[PDB]
Amino acid sequence: VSDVPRDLEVVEASPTSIQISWRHPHFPTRYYRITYGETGGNSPVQEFTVPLQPPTATISGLKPGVDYTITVYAVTDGRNGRLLSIPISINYRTHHHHHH
């Protein structure tokens, strides 16, 4: 496993799990939406929402040795009751190239 973060911390990880944390952004935020999907795209993207506090999530049940892209969205007020989802953080769940 190599977890490659952008604007988040990888707190804990295993072959099947990851615990990420991020910072509140520079604009008022209602809550966070976290998406994750196999990077190679054999399985569809899954989404869930978490409260504003704390800005930390753990995903488990990941397939061992399978790459995923994990995105953190800040969800905030838009116009006409349509919320805005602003991607603020990413983790790329990648794996070693193992020499053979």
Q: State the resolution, in angstroms.
A: 1.6
Cβ(47)–Cβ(7) under 8 Å? no
Between CA 9 and CA 21 the distance in angstroms is 5
Q: Are 58 and 19 in contact (CB under 8 A)?
A: yes
Preceding amide of 25 cis, omega within 30: no
The ranges assigned to domains in the chain are: 1-100
Dump strand ranges (E) for the chain: 2-6, 9-14, 17-21, 31-38, 46-50, 56-59, 68-76, 84-94
CA distance 20 to 55: 8
* CA 37 – CA 69 distance, rounded (Å): 6
Burial group, residue 72, by CB count within 10 angstroms (0-12, 13-18, 19+):
buried
